[PDB]
Design an enzyme around this catalytic site. Sequence first.
Site, PDB file in Angstrom:
ATOM      1  N   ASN A   1       5.674   7.422 -18.282  1.00 36.66           N
ATOM      2  CA  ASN A   1       6.413   8.661 -18.095  1.00 36.66           C
ATOM      3  C   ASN A   1       7.893   8.364 -18.142  1.00 36.66           C
ATOM      4  O   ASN A   1       8.292   7.198 -18.141  1.00 36.66           O
ATOM      5  CB  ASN A   1       6.099   9.309 -16.767  1.00 36.66           C
ATOM      6  CG  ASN A   1       4.857  10.173 -16.845  1.00 36.66           C
ATOM      7  OD1 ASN A   1       4.469  10.669 -17.906  1.00 36.66           O
ATOM      8  ND2 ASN A   1       4.203  10.378 -15.706  1.00 36.66           N
TER       9      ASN A   1
ATOM     10  N   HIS B   1      -0.586  17.059 -19.911  1.00 40.40           N
ATOM     11  CA  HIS B   1       0.218  16.697 -21.076  1.00 40.40           C
ATOM     12  C   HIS B   1      -0.281  17.307 -22.380  1.00 40.40           C
ATOM     13  O   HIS B   1      -0.243  16.698 -23.456  1.00 40.40           O
ATOM     14  CB  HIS B   1       0.288  15.169 -21.240  1.00 40.40           C
ATOM     15  CG  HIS B   1       1.051  14.422 -20.159  1.00 40.40           C
ATOM     16  ND1 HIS B   1       2.248  13.862 -20.290  1.00 40.40           N
ATOM     17  CD2 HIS B   1       0.595  14.153 -18.890  1.00 40.40           C
ATOM     18  CE1 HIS B   1       2.536  13.257 -19.168  1.00 40.40           C
ATOM     19  NE2 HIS B   1       1.540  13.440 -18.338  1.00 40.40           N
TER      20      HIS B   1
HETATM   21  C1  HEM Z   1      -4.684   8.793 -11.026  1.00 33.53           C
HETATM   22  C2  HEM Z   1      -3.634   9.360 -11.854  1.00 33.53           C
HETATM   23  C3  HEM Z   1      -3.721   9.731 -13.200  1.00 33.53           C
HETATM   24  C4  HEM Z   1      -4.800  10.153 -13.926  1.00 33.53           C
HETATM   25  C5  HEM Z   1      -6.262  10.267 -13.516  1.00 33.53           C
HETATM   26  C6  HEM Z   1      -4.307  10.493 -15.240  1.00 33.53           C
HETATM   27  C7  HEM Z   1      -5.085  11.091 -16.221  1.00 33.53           C
HETATM   28  C8  HEM Z   1      -4.621  11.536 -17.445  1.00 33.53           C
HETATM   29  C9  HEM Z   1      -5.446  12.143 -18.457  1.00 33.53           C
HETATM   30  C10 HEM Z   1      -6.954  12.323 -18.392  1.00 33.53           C
HETATM   31  C11 HEM Z   1      -4.627  12.445 -19.492  1.00 33.53           C
HETATM   32  C12 HEM Z   1      -5.039  13.039 -20.820  1.00 33.53           C
HETATM   33  C13 HEM Z   1      -5.591  11.979 -21.766  1.00 33.53           C
HETATM   34  C14 HEM Z   1      -6.219  12.532 -23.037  1.00 33.53           C
HETATM   35  O1  HEM Z   1      -6.958  13.511 -22.970  1.00 33.53           O
HETATM   36  O2  HEM Z   1      -5.978  11.982 -24.106  1.00 33.53           O
HETATM   37  C15 HEM Z   1      -3.303  12.009 -19.116  1.00 33.53           C
HETATM   38  C16 HEM Z   1      -2.232  11.968 -19.977  1.00 33.53           C
HETATM   39  C17 HEM Z   1      -1.056  11.287 -19.738  1.00 33.53           C
HETATM   40  N1  HEM Z   1      -0.748  10.619 -18.570  1.00 33.53           N
HETATM   41 FE1  HEM Z   1      -1.821  10.487 -16.953  1.00 33.53          FE
HETATM   42  N2  HEM Z   1      -2.952  10.247 -15.360  1.00 33.53           N
HETATM   43  C18 HEM Z   1      -2.585   9.777 -14.119  1.00 33.53           C
HETATM   44  C19 HEM Z   1      -1.326   9.268 -13.831  1.00 33.53           C
HETATM   45  C20 HEM Z   1      -0.301   9.098 -14.739  1.00 33.53           C
HETATM   46  C21 HEM Z   1       0.877   8.287 -14.489  1.00 33.53           C
HETATM   47  C22 HEM Z   1       1.257   7.683 -13.142  1.00 33.53           C
HETATM   48  C23 HEM Z   1       1.535   8.175 -15.677  1.00 33.53           C
HETATM   49  C24 HEM Z   1       2.666   7.421 -15.990  1.00 33.53           C
HETATM   50  C25 HEM Z   1       2.885   6.025 -15.646  1.00 33.53           C
HETATM   51  C26 HEM Z   1       0.776   8.977 -16.625  1.00 33.53           C
HETATM   52  C27 HEM Z   1       1.172   9.243 -17.923  1.00 33.53           C
HETATM   53  C28 HEM Z   1       0.474  10.025 -18.825  1.00 33.53           C
HETATM   54  C29 HEM Z   1       0.916  10.310 -20.168  1.00 33.53           C
HETATM   55  C30 HEM Z   1       2.192   9.802 -20.818  1.00 33.53           C
HETATM   56  C31 HEM Z   1      -0.039  11.091 -20.730  1.00 33.53           C
HETATM   57  C32 HEM Z   1      -0.050  11.684 -22.127  1.00 33.53           C
HETATM   58  C33 HEM Z   1      -0.537  10.760 -23.222  1.00 33.53           C
HETATM   59  C34 HEM Z   1      -0.488  11.483 -24.557  1.00 33.53           C
HETATM   60  O3  HEM Z   1       0.601  11.753 -25.049  1.00 33.53           O
HETATM   61  O4  HEM Z   1      -1.537  11.794 -25.106  1.00 33.53           O
HETATM   62  N3  HEM Z   1      -0.370   9.493 -16.058  1.00 33.53           N
HETATM   63  N4  HEM Z   1      -3.307  11.419 -17.865  1.00 33.53           N
END
Ligand code: HEM
Lengths: 488, 488, 488, 488
Positions: free
Chosen positions: A129, A56
């Site tokens: 999401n 993202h």
């Molecule tokens: C085991 C699965 C997952 C892991 C380890 C994970 C990990 C991450 C990481 C590390 C980031 C970046 C955070 C940052 O640097 O600030 C990210 C961003 C994001 N993830 Fe995941 N994620 C996973 C599953 C999901 C799922 C299932 C959703 C939705 C329900 C999701 C939605 C998001 C969103 C919306 C962002 C962006 C947030 C922003 O705008 O800064 N993620 N994710």
Amino acid sequence: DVREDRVVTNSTGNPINEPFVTQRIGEHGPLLLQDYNLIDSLAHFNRENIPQRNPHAHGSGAFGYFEVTDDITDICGSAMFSKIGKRTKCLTRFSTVGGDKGSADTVRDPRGFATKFYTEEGNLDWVYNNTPVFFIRDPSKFPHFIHTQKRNPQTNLRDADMFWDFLTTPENQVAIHQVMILFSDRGTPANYRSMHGYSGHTYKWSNKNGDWHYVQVHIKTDQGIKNLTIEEATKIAGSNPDYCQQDLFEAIQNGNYPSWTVYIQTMTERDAKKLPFSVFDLTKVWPQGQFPLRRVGKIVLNENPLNFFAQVEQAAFAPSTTVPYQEASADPVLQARLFSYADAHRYRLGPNFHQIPVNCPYASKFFNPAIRDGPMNVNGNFGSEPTYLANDKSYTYIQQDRPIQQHQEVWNGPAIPYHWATSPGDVDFVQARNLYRVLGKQPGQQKNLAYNIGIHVEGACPQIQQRVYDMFARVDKGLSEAIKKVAE
Amino acid sequence: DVREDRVVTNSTGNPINEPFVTQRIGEHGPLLLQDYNLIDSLAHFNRENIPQRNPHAHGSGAFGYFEVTDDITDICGSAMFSKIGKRTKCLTRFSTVGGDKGSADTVRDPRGFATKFYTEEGNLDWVYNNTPVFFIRDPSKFPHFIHTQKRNPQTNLRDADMFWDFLTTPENQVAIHQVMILFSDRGTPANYRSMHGYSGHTYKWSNKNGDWHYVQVHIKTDQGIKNLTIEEATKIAGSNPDYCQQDLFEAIQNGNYPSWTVYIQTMTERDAKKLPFSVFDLTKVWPQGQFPLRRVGKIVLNENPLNFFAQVEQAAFAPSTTVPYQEASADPVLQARLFSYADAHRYRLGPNFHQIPVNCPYASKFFNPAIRDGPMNVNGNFGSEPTYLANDKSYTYIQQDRPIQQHQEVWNGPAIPYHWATSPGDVDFVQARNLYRVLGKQPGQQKNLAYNIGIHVEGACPQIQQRVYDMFARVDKGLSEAIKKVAE
Amino acid sequence: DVREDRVVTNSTGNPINEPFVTQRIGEHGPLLLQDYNLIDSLAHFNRENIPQRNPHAHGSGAFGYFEVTDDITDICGSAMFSKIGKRTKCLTRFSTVGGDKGSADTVRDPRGFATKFYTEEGNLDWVYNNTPVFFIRDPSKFPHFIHTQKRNPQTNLRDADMFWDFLTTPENQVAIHQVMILFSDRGTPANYRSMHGYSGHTYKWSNKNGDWHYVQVHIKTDQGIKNLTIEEATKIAGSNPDYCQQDLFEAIQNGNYPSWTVYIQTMTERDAKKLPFSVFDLTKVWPQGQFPLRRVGKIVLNENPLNFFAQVEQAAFAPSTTVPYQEASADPVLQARLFSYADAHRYRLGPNFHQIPVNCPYASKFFNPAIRDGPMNVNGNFGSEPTYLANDKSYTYIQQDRPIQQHQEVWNGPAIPYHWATSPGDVDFVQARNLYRVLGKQPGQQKNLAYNIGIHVEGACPQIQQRVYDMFARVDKGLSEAIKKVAE
Amino acid sequence: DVREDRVVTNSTGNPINEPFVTQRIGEHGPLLLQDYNLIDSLAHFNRENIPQRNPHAHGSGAFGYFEVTDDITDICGSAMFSKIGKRTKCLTRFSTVGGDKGSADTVRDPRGFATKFYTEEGNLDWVYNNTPVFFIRDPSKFPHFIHTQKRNPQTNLRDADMFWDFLTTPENQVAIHQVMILFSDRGTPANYRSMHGYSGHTYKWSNKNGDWHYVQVHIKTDQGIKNLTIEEATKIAGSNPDYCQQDLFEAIQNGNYPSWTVYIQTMTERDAKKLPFSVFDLTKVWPQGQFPLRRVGKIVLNENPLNFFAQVEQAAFAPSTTVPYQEASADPVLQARLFSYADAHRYRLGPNFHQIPVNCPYASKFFNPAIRDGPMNVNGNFGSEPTYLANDKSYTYIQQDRPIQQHQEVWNGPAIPYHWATSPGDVDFVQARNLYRVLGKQPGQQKNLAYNIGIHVEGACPQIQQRVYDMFARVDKGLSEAIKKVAE
Ligand code: HEM
Ligand code: HEM
């Protein structure tokens, strides 16, 4: 902020008497080391960038508020919901998933929809999401999955063989409900204002009595769903890579503020036991006939960021940032997410990232005697406050009799290393098929789904193309045939 | 370094039983903290990204060699030029300038052309662009300039007002020769194989006898200049964002190796005095009639990298990385560049970035008793070697009689704060005007230049648009009218 | 690694002419920006330091080996114990706890005794202290506790009020067994060669047939226990701050290699439930009468580091670095340490800290397709290997049906937030009292215990002094009176 | 800033309902990943430390003010000096040089005396030592020299062979004036209130008419010079490692505020030409007979820091932080220092170190359109302000006619690689010898000098000891004999 007399200075406030002069011998001799203002500017320039989010990386943001429109205090005791008409300020960041920081807005991807609420009981992040489900139900599979969504390690090109090799691997085929949604036209939204947001996971919300429910959140757009075809999306990706960013900025600037209505589906523990699937499974949705959408409130985004880097790029969202009475369920993916995001913020932003203004809880100030020091501790480090709980000092712990999760499920078993591979049979394919039939009710969509999958799978190896056709034949053989025709 | 038995382990080499198992209570209970393999993988995933280059964030790379084809030992005494037929291993990174890491390949921009030669006298970096000149001749102006090439601080959109406001500011209008080349079709090349490389700056090369010359290098493509129009470039930007990466990778993979012929112009200190302009000015080119191109050798890129991140993204190029007998001139922009790149590397990659394999001088091993310690010192840190010049140990300093720059110009003057603002009169507009004359020989190119500027200027506000017309009117009034017709 | 011709170069391998020349106008005019060799040296000098360990900042190290002298394969199936006479290279780092990097060796503190074994099944870290127990049994107490052991937030002085205020707080008084060992002369050892090492926590070791035992490890000195009195230790603290470092270096340099004999105590699950205290409690020791010491092998340290920074300071030890058949118990403090150390290493050393030579598993190389990239990836980053488990490639997962912890305890209950405060009655004071009786058999040690506490407590204010007397009166009223006599 | 209700929260402001509870299955089962509050505390604990200063790692500090008591507006036009009685707030950090952060206060070393003045024209740092001279006059010699002052690369011990081998090397023997001061009892002050501060270097101060002078600054203690003997210093180093920190803290706490009187020595360019040595040589002092001390004002330290880490440890001092009318001279060591400190700050504290409260120019706010972004940009990043000098916006550049250094010396010469090695003859030994004679006026100081050198040299290798005796014989043969007598 900016000093009123608008005097341009270097970093340490010393006035610069001419904007561009650099010291040298004579007018055209060698540059001198004593020109510290040149080094000050060039060295800060070299340090402007922080690591992009993984994933993202590419995104947009805006400020607004959440407003409680209906009573849900019997489901959740959080202070942000306590009274009808109560507003809580928020920050939302929208984003794509696989592309790097300079990538286009109108590409095929899930969109992130992350909101931060500044409540009286601390910040709350709803890191959602724009899709009801996701590709995996095993947390360990996430590094592997995002790697196949990004670029080949050697060629640095997006590789259709990697993409489809992962998804058609038998134990990973539980991703099919999500692959269907991604390759429908909802995978290319018209803009951020005309898409939904979903918790994906089941969370556990409790009221003040201790009664609790499994909940799933739906943030429905009041502007209505609108999508782009992949051909429109590809043209716009080349003419205006910042199309969705421009649309959100200009809509708020013109007073056409976007709003979303927040709904929840509730379920008791007894109801969960009677379901044909697990409430802890991210790849499944709850029937709205049986579990209808109960209304909670509204999210209106009415204010643009003044500075994108400081307020949006530096914004940090984490599912572990939660208020009282809202907790995570035993969903394996959400459980791992309780660690991952705050860990990523300590790397990407720094140890004291919570002191950056947008990440700061202004309505419930951070105070913890033992969380001290670290690089760029800028709020005073609580002065001379003891670094432990000193007995000649006073400390307040509110809601001491409030349970975190003791009052909920009782667990039994050894520590089992488990891989929740795609189940035998049809249980992990039923909902993908029900979604295919719901696309039949909307004209042109079943045809478009086949075309979208087909033009993407075309790039793949013929062995991998056959595995794609077989996987989709298990959803619908007609859909499988239609994909093959477009791909060839 | 992939182990032959291909046993999958965690970071500390402990073997993993099953690729995706994660520990929980029972089969579907909460995740456990004792699963260090899950935390190991998720925490390393969070740390995959390093900040992108500022600027030239987006790029492609390839290995190859330089071969001497002609004797220029009378001009330069560097070991890589000693014998005809002598080969030196090199690494070239091509790139765009303003766009972020995930932006498209076929956009309007300068292209970087940076080569790293691994010589017997240490590494040499020819950090060149694909254009003869550049936008500025004042080093302090570079943070300001790159900021206007990127995104607006609030809207995060690329803004035509910032872009043209900086370039039309009177003291910055010396950028006009470079703006002309930028908005020609040479500003959007068909690929990296069909573009040139140029020194930009004047360098000082000297032979072993102590005689020196002002030198400008020309890396001409053997595949010939091939360009795209802006409509073509914009279609491909949405269609294939990695068009030039795919082209370079596939060309080397199919054995159709791109090559370039290296040429130099030489000049004496006495000839520099008889010149209408300064040899220290980046915005000026040396006339080829008076100073003809003299052939030196060839650059052949014949090998793709195995890992893009490790070998191309972690590559560090710097003007200050130079060999014996090659030195920088008093060009103020080059002078500041001797500081900026190595400083940027220390932040981006780390204090010991020179120990990363592609940045390592393998043909002239780094040894210095006082350059010790620092984060990630992975090459042994010279073991028990004294951290100073111990009298009971031996240290060799070669070429003690070789001068660095004391044999060249004699400078006179105080330390003057100088801003080399656009000269009154016509001297800084003459070469942009003769460049317009050269485009008249090529059919349709003057029309394309006016179109390319007109569709870009179209997005600016009326006041800035008029300043753009007056600036181009000063080159040629017909050009100015043609841009104004396209902008309307 | 030093080049044998010993030519001094800068970071990029370019030869330096004269060791100390720096460029200026004339011989005594201002310094020039173009002297990149001066800036290379000064900028690297500025980046020599990494953050010190928190805690155990101050320490020493040496290489050696572990040799199996007995068969314990009925208890543990790890490859390092498979044959008698089998040697495994190790690295031990000894250290103090509270003091910063420049503090003296002969101060009152626990000493760290951390050993890294480079086995065929990856690295194994035995991160032990020189005491059988520790101050806490709640992991959340650790930030608070180390803070009180260090410096007051304002005065930056070591503060006797903080120190004793934390330890005499009722819910923390379970620290009393460790406070007794700390304030005996064992708290000031003569050197690192004449002290023991202990597991502290219970671990779970299992054989190849799936049978397991609760284990505690004892690393006994073959040189014999030798201690300093506090007056001797204070005089050497001023005289030679590096006394214990000097002693370890000189003993190995003179060939008087220190050795230790490794013993284990084993216990079954049935035996654990009959104990009057918990096997998961760090503040308790297992009676040797009922659970005798069983010999395993020898650790011999016989090789000094060539470079202290690169090999001892950059060394990374973690309880989570464990080989097959050796796992952690449910001891809450050990459970949190399974997260803490590897997390600290990613900050202190960097994302790819495991690529630093001393942390590298040389006998079982690191290979994992999904653990890629990150700053300072220097081992090649597996080249063009897929960043997931590609189906056209092969991957080996050994010991597929070997259990991690499924074969052990069955847990039952909800997720309870728990604070294991000092238990009612005498249970957490009993072992402290029998430790006082053991010191009565060794003449002078009871008077020295009272003196050592008395001179430290003297610096506390009278309210806290009274709480200290009260806490020690609970062990022995005579001890308490004697502490009061020295303190007043 | 602590919240009034004193509610303990985690980093994101969510209230903790019990200070030490951690989640597990049952009361004594394994820990859960779900406990994000435990990981929030432990991960921040792992990130409390920043790298220590290199050098001057160990120190103390306090706030106070500078008051003008005499007119020097004819020498310097800086606003902090403009009226008699004008106060400017300041921060002083006192320190040792070679020792690490945990080292003792009463060791032999120079002491640092760095003062930051918060003036209306930005911050001013007088980064001075407590000695008139220093060990080197070549900037390149600095990494080498500090390495020999610290620990041996292998043994980690302070090494007398490194120490004296560097100093007795013929071209480094210009250090002898400083070695004489270091080994006198002035090398071990009784405390920070009993020592002087000196600019060391020649600076150039200018009045508003453009008239300038070479200036050396003397900060004389009003408490008087008071020293320890090396025996007293070694005893206090073991007994109380924080003796001077405690002394400074308690003096200010008890209202006995330390003050210093500030004086300057001025000199014209004509007088500089008549001197027997260079004004650019750090190892030389100016005679007070001919160039008397003219009084300027007072520094009173009357306020202790509230938090040592945030205010003293995070404090950044640099010679390049200077106000108008105060500039650096062409002293080669000062010239290099204009680069080194701000560079060290970018590493040690971060890109935005100037935003940390104690480094912030509060009386003249930082405002620069092009110094933007970077990690931990917490002051708002100037909001939507243009990232360049936009023509529709306004910018004030004050003191446009004030010269930086043009009005001063005219330099002539090529770029010469120069090593200012010890001059032939006696010019670099003369002042060391008249210092020995000045020590003869005080009873017991010449015996103490010989003893202090003798007990240190004793620990060196025989051929290095002989070189020490030969170097000191060149000052006085009786001195050399006395050193030899103690060393044996
Ligand atoms: C085991 C699965 C997952 C892991 C380890 C994970 C990990 C991450 C990481 C590390 C980031 C970046 C955070 C940052 O640097 O600030 C990210 C961003 C994001 N993830 Fe995941 N994620 C996973 C599953 C999901 C799922 C299932 C959703 C939705 C329900 C999701 C939605 C998001 C969103 C919306 C962002 C962006 C947030 C922003 O705008 O800064 N993620 N994710
Ligand atoms: C005062 C003006 C300039 C400054 C301060 C400057 C600074 C920089 C910096 C800091 C980078 C990124 C370095 C890194 O992180 O590795 C960069 C990259 C680059 N610059 Fe400049 N630059 C300037 C002018 C120019 C000019 C005139 C040219 C061409 C002759 C040039 C060609 C390049 C190239 C080719 C790269 C990309 C190197 C790569 O592929 O990694 N720059 N520049």
